Amino acid sequence: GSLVCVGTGLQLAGQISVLSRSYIEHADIVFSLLPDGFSQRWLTKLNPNVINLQQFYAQNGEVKNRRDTYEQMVNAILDAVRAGKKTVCALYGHPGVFACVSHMAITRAKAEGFSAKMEPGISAEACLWADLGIDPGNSGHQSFEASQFMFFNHVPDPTTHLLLWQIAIAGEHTLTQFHTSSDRLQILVEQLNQWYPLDHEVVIYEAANLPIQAPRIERLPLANLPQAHLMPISTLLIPPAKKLEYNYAILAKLGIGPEDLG
């Protein structure tokens, strides 16, 4: 048995890499986590032996800690590998970006003596740079899980493009609900106000999943975030609040100044 984790990207059918599609094609069994029924149909046509990982999420109002959901997904994948199957895990996006299940399964498979690897894919953030016409290198980039930004000590650089992922569950500390409350988002606004003014224009971004669909690109002042409509897939982009300023200390040690820059 062996494990290969691949990503399918965000867009139906065409955003998977050529090699990643061939892995799906030739698998004994595929464990999937895909955005919708169109994507599920496409996968099933590629390889009919599919187990849908969506089944491990809380059903019908059940209280279930997402740590248990993830543990159950990893165990299901590993049960196929342990049985001797040439196993592929097909996740949306990139299988290792804001996605613990593939890293955990690869770690556990290697510890038990099996071959396991991860193929890169196109993430929501890769889609954002394209759709918004922004280069993360322009003034640099920072990414955090929104709840981690609230629960732990993180300090953003306000010259960079800042991304808060999983904004729809910001501050949802139990890992048992699917969305947060407006009061939690208000606290996040107050926290960000250490670096960003309340009227600072931010962007709610959602990558499209169908070829006929435009991405969501909603611009609004930071103050209005707690009233906005958010979905689990939403990401909050916070553009720079200041422009790049010259680092005179280092320029001197280098023996140059601004006027010397090419």
Q: Taking CB under 8 A as the criterion, which residues in 114-143 touch a copy of itself?
A: 118-123, 126-127, 129-130, 133-137, 139-143
CA gap 152, 225 in Å, rounded: 21
Among 60, 111, 155, 214, binds a copy of itself (CB under 8 A): 155
Question: Is 166 known to sit in a ligand binding site?
Answer: yes
Q: How many CB atoms lie within 10 A of CB 49?
A: 12
Question: Is 147 known to sit in a ligand binding site?
Answer: no
Q: How many CB atoms lie within 10 A of CB 210?
A: 14
Contact 97, 122 (CB under 8 A): no
Question: Is 141 known to sit in a ligand binding site?
Answer: yes
Sole window of 40-48, 185-193, 214-222, 226-234 interacting with a copy of itself (rule: CB under 8 A): 185-193
Polymer length in residues for the chain:
262
User: Per rule CB under 8 A, is residue 108 in the interface with a copy of itself?
Assistant: no
Q: Which two tokens stand for residue 155?
A: 């300090």
Burial class (CB in 10 A: 0-12, 13-18, 19+), 132: middle
> Which pairing describes strands 141-145 and 50-52: parallel, antiparallel, or unpaired?
unpaired
219 classed as catalytic? no
Among 150, 202, 222, 233, binds a copy of itself (CB under 8 A): 150
CA gap 178, 168 in Å, rounded: 8
Q: How many residues sit in the footprint of a copy of itself (CB under 8 A)?
A: 81
Q: Which two tokens stand for residue 247?
A: 């680092």
What DSSP string describes 68-95? HHHHHHHHHHHHHHHHT-EEEEEESB-T
92 classed as catalytic? yes
Q: Out of 92, 108, 196, 205, pick the active-site residue.
A: 92
Q: Give the footprint of other proteins on this chain (CB under 8 A).
A: 2, 4, 11-15, 18-19, 22-23, 25-26, 33-38, 40-42, 45, 54, 57, 59, 66-67, 70, 86, 91-92, 98-101, 115, 135, 137, 144-152, 165-166, 169, 173, 175, 178, 209-214, 232-233, 244, 261-262
How are strands ordered across the β-sheet holding 29-33? 50-52, 29-33, 86-91, 2-7, 115-118
Question: Is 181 known to sit in a ligand binding site?
Answer: no
| Per-residue contact string for residues 5-24; x = within reach of a copy of itself by CB under 8 A | ----x-x-xxxxxxxxxx--
Nearer to other proteins, 212 or 249 (CB): 212
Contact 127, 165 (CB under 8 A): no
Nearer to other proteins, 174 or 199 (CB): 174
197 binds, among a copy of itself, other proteins, none (CB under 5 to 8 A by kind): none
Among 107, 115, 193, 224, binds a copy of itself (CB under 8 A): 107
Instruction: Give the residue ranges of the annotated binding site.
Output: 94, 124-125, 141, 166, 207, 232, 234-235
User: Mind telling me the catalytic residues?
Assistant: 66, 70, 92
